[PDB]
Amino acid sequence: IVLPPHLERIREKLAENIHELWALTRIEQGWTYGPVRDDNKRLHPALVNFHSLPEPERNYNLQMSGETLKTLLALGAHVGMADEKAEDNLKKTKLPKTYMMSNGYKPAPLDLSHVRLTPAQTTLVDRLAENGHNVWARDRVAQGWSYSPARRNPRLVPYRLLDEATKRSNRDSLAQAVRTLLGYGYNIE
């Protein structure tokens, strides 16, 4: 079931904030920019503005954001605009210059400190995490979705096989995705 047209804008904004959060998480752990990945020196080429990612990487991120939204809908959630003023009123987290990369990129995820999941929303985050298509893309160090010798990609690790710490990282990523939607003024019921 394709993503409804009225959720296409939020698919883009969601992917952008997920990238900012991912980049922050990496930079906290000592990662810095370089054009070729180096896991010993912790250099990563994705520590750039979202719009400056290679098109295939941007497209993958948009696909993953869209599949969070489609999985919410498959779980029966009602997702719709409720507060048209919320987006204008959003602010970004202002990090110190110690978070800026050599290319001038500094992450600026949304300040969602005011957002509080309702019980039904907490339950939807839990059901997203437990859904059979949820994976940890271990090489991307990120939550993602897998929707369709060796056919399967073992590096997309099903949630049910993760150790507790990585389950917690995966679930928290989905919590921030849902809180991002709420921050932009969507109700989720």
Author numbering: 861 to 1008, 1014 to 1054
Task: Tell me what the authors wrote about this structure, in their words.
Ryanodine receptors (RyRs) form ∼2.2 MDa calcium release channels located in the membrane of the sarcoplasmic and endoplasmic reticulum. Triggered by either cytosolic or luminal Ca2+, or by conformational changes in the skeletal muscle dihydropyridine receptor, these proteins govern several Ca2+-dependent processes, including the contraction of skeletal and cardiac muscle. RyRs contain three different SPRY domains, named after ‘SPlA kinase and Ryanodine Receptor' where they were first discovered. RyRs bind many accessory proteins and small molecules that affect their gating properties allosterically.
The SPRY1 and SPRY2 domains are separated in sequence by tandem repeats, encoded by RyR1 residues 862-1054 (‘Repeats12'). We solved the crystal structure of RyR1 Repeat12 at 1.5 Å resolution, which shows that its two halves are not symmetrical. Each repeat consists of two α helices, and short single β-strands at each C terminus assemble to form a two-stranded β-sheet. However, Repeat2 also contains an extra three-stranded β-sheet which breaks the symmetry. This sheet is formed at the expense of its first α helix (α1'), which is considerably shorter than the corresponding helix in Repeat1 (α1). The β-sheet fills up the space between Repeat1 and Repeat2 and mediates extra interactions, including a salt bridge between Arg1,000 and Glu917. The two Repeats are separated by an unusual 30-residue loop that is completely structured. This loop forms a large U-shaped lid (‘U-lid') that makes intimate interactions with the α-helices of Repeat1. However, the RyR1 R1043C mutation (R1044C in rabbit RyR1) affects a residue that is involved in multiple hydrogen bonds, including main chain atoms from the U-lid.
